[PDB]
């Protein structure tokens, strides 16, 4: 599939389908779903990295919601993006 070629774990096909069925535009470019998938995967990686750091500071090995909210709140850029 295209995601493997791009070097992405996220579902390029799912993103492309969502873009098309959302009727956001008459046409969806070939590179648009790849770019959007890369961005979403990057943001997921950021949030997961910071949540994992928060959990590891408590010496846990599990990211429960407390750690996730703590990581988002203590990171100004993510705080502004996600509240």
């Amino acid at each position: 599939s295209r995601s493997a070629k791009a070097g992405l774990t996220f579902p390029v096909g799912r993103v492309h389908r969502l873009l098309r069925r959302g009727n956001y535009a008459q046409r969806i470019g070939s590179g648009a779903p790849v770019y959007l998938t890369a961005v979403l995967e990057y943001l997921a990686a950021e949030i997961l990295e910071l949540a994992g750091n928060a959990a590891r500071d408590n010496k846990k090995t599990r990211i429960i919601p407390r750690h996730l909210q703590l990581a988002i709140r203590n990171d100004d850029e993510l705080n502004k993006l996600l509240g």
Partner: protein
């Protein structure tokens, strides 16, 4: 011991003693928290005092735990750390309190919440035996509250490895199935077990590796046993002993069934089981509706889950009897409770918010909407026949009649086109029934509102298969408007406005009604909007703006138009939006209404429009002038409206001198004194347009003030986020006053450059590059001279400015702006200046090895690495990329060439270059990659 006194004081009424007790408690912890925690634990455990005293002791523990238990808490205070020996003590005490069913419910709940917090911080590294103790309690002592605690902590503590592989999952399922199979279990025990089962299903729904054979087999076995058991449970009956427990029990069963259906592969929960549970679910709808004879609330929740299941298995065929049962049950369930009727009738804004779909409440009405919206076409047509037949019989039973009309509304919202053998006769009868409902004099208010909202749906769904659709649409619309008028209920008026909005969706009213009746209905809708606008909540005002946007669209485009309608239209646009400028919907739709009200415009009409509108605005600007123009939603709103007028100039000339006389001085003051980002942004945009579109000879005396405002904005006395629109203002000043300003171009250009390089905001750099594009189109060589002679940090501004400009090209917005940038860059290219040839910019990124995602953490050691290319090469690459978005040798291509749109610009540019700039483009073409060469040559064909 003295902790008890503090508990009393903190638990007391008066502030002074409660504050004293709270402090005294805190300093003790600040000294040592060991004493306080030990004392509070002993208080909860042993005093046997008033239940309120123990409950408050537990509450204090709740508050103290987060402050002093561990740094893991955000609210942690470093004054002292709870002694380890005390930690074990309070853990033990909390377990003894929570697990013992005989304790009072308040004590158990307090202990449970404290345990939740402590476990969230301590399990499993600090508090190993938590799950051991909980499962010992559940298995041996049968502690029901232990099951509730386990349910609450399950997801926080039980990780995948323990669940699938540590045996915790199997142990939990053993507990659940032993509880459910045991015939003697009380309904409370079964409900707790079913909630714990929901927790297990959640855990099984997704896991790190689906393919693991052991995990797959475990999931299959658990799901099979669960479905068998739930099949057995639903067959039970309890002889009306406790209806609330039974309703909760059914609710949780169907929640679990929905979860299994929706979150696991279809290979589980085969179709035969789906049929069996469909029959059971229908029978349970009947049972619940009869039990209805907090009872109502629980009934409605159970109904939500049952109907959610039916929605999940709606693909199956439903027998005629099953459709009749479902329709009767939903008729009973979907009728409005007396409380909702009173709320809507007393405050129509709630009705408007719900009907427009803005209200957050989700209830059986919405779930019934979901069910009918999902049916397939054969079932949908049959159930439409059922609902229509029920409406035909229930035409004198008002209580059910609204429920039936809402069900019909839900059906008609289904995408599949209703079609059937006898539907045409049913549709004729239904149309007659709706006409009778409107004409009936004694009809209740809510039924009438539902009929009015439903009729548009009936007409839309059968836009085909209805003869004389146009007379029907005209008659129904006229009747609904006439009822909305000359009636004193805001429900009817708001419902009629929303019904009008529905009409506009499917019918071109101006064509359907004709120009005359179209104008008449515009006047009627305007009158209704005036009448209801006096009692509008925020959501109601948003809805009124939508309605008015619809009404304005139908005003005659003929050279003749009713000036009264235009005036009233603008009056409403300004009045409604002035009430609550902060409402986002009102602002956006006000801009829509104003734009389309100025869609096409000529001078004579404009002078009247500005004569009415603008004097209102100067009132607002002067009003805020006393406020020194601090931020105000109304101020921003009026600024946006002024920008809309200035943007929608009449094509037949420059702006009147009156607009200059009206707006210049107020805007001049706004830019001279305001200090907040948004206000200065909007004022700068409006002022730039005012300067740009006014006749030059009519404004030159004002040049001094213009430059004064510009110099204020350039000084950076206003922050960079402010003065965002200075670019366009400088462009306008240069365009109108090119000759008079020449001596000042150097300073203005250097200040603009200084702003451009430092800023990181995309919009600011775009606007500032607009100035460079203007100067380059006017005279490229002079722009190059200024940028090269100007110095920042001991480097010519050119290298920095060109690098910014090239990088900014990727993201500039707008057709005209893209074209402006293209022509500016084209001029730089043709100039073929050595100073430019020596400039170097950044090409593509060099990827690193592997597939690692580079986060901000890694950036320090994995920076973005570019490749360095001369400026002109990057110009050409940018243009080729643009061609690729829009849509094999140089010598042959050059020979091939010899023998207003973006693509037009780019193609003409390339042809001219290849013909003329032989050596510069030749070398670049020789270095372009083959895909680029192919796009370029294909475009050049």
């Amino acid at each position: 011991m003295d902790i008890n006194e503090l508990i009393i004081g903190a638990q007391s009424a008066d502030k002074h003693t409660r504050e004293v007790a709270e402090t005294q408690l805190l300093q003790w912890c600040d000294s040592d928290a060991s004493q306080v925690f030990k004392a509070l634990a002993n208080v909860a455990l042993q005093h046997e005092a008033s239940l309120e005293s123990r409950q408050f002791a537990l509450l204090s523990l709740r508050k103290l735990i987060t402050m002093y238990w561990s740094p893991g808490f955000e609210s942690y205070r470093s004054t002292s750390n709870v002694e380890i020996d005390v930690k074990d003590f309070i853990r033990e005490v909390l377990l003894k309190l929570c697990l013992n069913d005989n304790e009072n419910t308040k004590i158990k709940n307090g202990a449970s919440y404290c345990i939740v917090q402590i476990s969230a911080v301590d399990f499993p590294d600090q508090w190993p035996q938590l799950l051991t103790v909980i499962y010992d309690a559940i298995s041996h002592q049968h502690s029901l509250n232990a099951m509730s605690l386990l349910n609450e902590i399950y997801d926080d503590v039980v990780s995948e490895e323990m669940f699938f592989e540590g045996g915790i999952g199997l142990a939990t399922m053993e507990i659940v199935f032993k509880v459910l199979n045991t015939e003697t279990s009380t309904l409370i025990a079964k409900i707790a077990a079913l909630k714990l089962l929901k927790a297990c299903l959640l855990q099984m729904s997704s896991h790190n590796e689906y393919d693991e054979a052991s995990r797959k087999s475990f999931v299959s076995q658990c799901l099979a046993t669960s479905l068998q058991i739930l099949g057995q449970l639903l067959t039970l009956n309890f002889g009306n002993v406790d209806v609330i427990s039974q309703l909760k029990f059914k609710s949780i069963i169907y929640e679990n069934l929905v979860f299994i259906k929706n979150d696991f592969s279809r290979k589980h929960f085969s179709s035969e089981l789906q049929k069996q549970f469909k029959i059971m679910a229908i029978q349970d709808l009947e049972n619940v509706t009869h039990i209805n004879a907090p009872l109502l609330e629980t009934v409605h929740d159970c109904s939500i889950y049952i109907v959610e299941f039916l929605t999940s298995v709606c693909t199956l065929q439903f027998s005629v009897e099953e459709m009749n049962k479902i329709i009767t049950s939903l008729t009973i369930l979907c009728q409005l409770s007396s409380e909702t009727r009173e709320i809507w009738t007393s405050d129509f804004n709630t009705f408007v918010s719900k009907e427009t779909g803005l209200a957050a409440s989700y209830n059986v009405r919405d779930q019934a909407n979901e069910f009918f919206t999902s049916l397939p076409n054969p079932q949908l047509s049959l159930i439409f026949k059922v609902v229509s037949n029920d409406i035909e019989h229930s035409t004198c039973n008002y209580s059910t009649l609204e429920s039936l009309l809402y069900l019909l509304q839900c059906i008609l919202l289904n995408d599949d086109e209703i079609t059937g053998e006898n539907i045409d006769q049913s549709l004729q009868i239904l149309i007659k029934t709706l006409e009778n409902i409107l004409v009936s004099q004694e009809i209740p208010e809510l039924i009438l509102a539902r009929a009015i909202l439903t009729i548009p749906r009936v007409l839309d769904k059968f836009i085909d298969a209805l003869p004389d659709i146009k007379p029907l649409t005209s008659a129904f619309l006229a009747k609904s408007l006439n009822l909305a008028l000359k009636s004193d209920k805001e429900l009817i008026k708001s419902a009629t406005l929303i019904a009008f909005t529905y009409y506009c969706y499917f019918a071109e009213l101006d064509s359907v009604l004709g120009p005359e009746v179209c104008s008449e209905t515009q006047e009627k809708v305007i009158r209704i909007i005036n009448q209801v606008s006096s009692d509008a909540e925020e959501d109601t005002n948003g809805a009124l703006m939508e309605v008015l946007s619809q009404v304005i669209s139908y005003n005659p485009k003929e050279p003749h138009s009713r000036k009264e309608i235009l005036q009233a239209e603008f009056h409403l646009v300004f009045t409604i939006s002035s009430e609550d400028p902060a409402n986002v919907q009102v602002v956006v739709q006000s801009q829509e209404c104003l734009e389309k009200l100025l869609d096409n415009i000529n001078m004579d009409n404009y002078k009247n429009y500005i004569e009415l509108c603008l004097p209102s605005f100067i009132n607002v600007l002067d009003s805020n002038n006393a406020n020194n123009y601090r931020y105000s939603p109304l101020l921003s709103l009026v600024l946006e409206f002024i920008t809309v007028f200035l943007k929608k100039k009449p094509n037949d000339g420059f702006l009147p001198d009156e607009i200059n006389q009206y707006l210049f001085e107020p805007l001049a003051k706004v830019l001279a004194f305001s200090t907040e980002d948004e206000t200065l942004q909007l004022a700068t945009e409006a002022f730039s347009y005012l300067i740009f579109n006014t006749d030059t000879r009519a404004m030159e005396p004002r040049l001094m003030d213009i430059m004064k405002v510009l110099e204020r904005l350039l000084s950076l006395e206003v922050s960079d986020s402010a003065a965002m629109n200075v670019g366009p203002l400088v462009v306008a000043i240069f365009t109108r006053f090119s000759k008079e300003i020449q001596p000042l171009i150097g300073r203005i250009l250097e200040a603009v450059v200084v702003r451009l390089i430092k800023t990181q905001n995309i919009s600011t750099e775009q606007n500032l590059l607009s100035v460079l594009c203007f100067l380059t189109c006017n005279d490229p060589k002079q722009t190059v001279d200024f940028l090269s002679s100007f110095q920042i940090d001991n480097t010519d501004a050119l290298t920095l400015v060109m690098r910014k400009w090239i990088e900014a090209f990727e993201v500039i917005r707008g057709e005209k702006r893209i074209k402006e940038n293209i022509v500016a860059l084209s001029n730089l290219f043709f100039l073929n200046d050595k100073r430019l040839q020596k400039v170097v910019v950044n090409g593509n990124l060099i990827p690193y090895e592997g597939d690692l995602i580079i986060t901000r953490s890694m950036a320090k050691k994995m920076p973005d690495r570019y490749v360095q290319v001369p400026l002109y090469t990057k110009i050409i690459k940018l243009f080729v990329s643009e061609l690729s978005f829009q849509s094999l040798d140089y010598d042959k291509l050059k020979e091939y060439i010899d023998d207003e749109s973006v693509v037009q610009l780019l193609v003409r540019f390339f042809k001219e270059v290849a013909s003329k700039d032989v050596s510069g483009f030749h070398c670049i073409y020789e270095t372009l990659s083959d895909s680029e060469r192919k796009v370029l040559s294909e475009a050049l064909l």
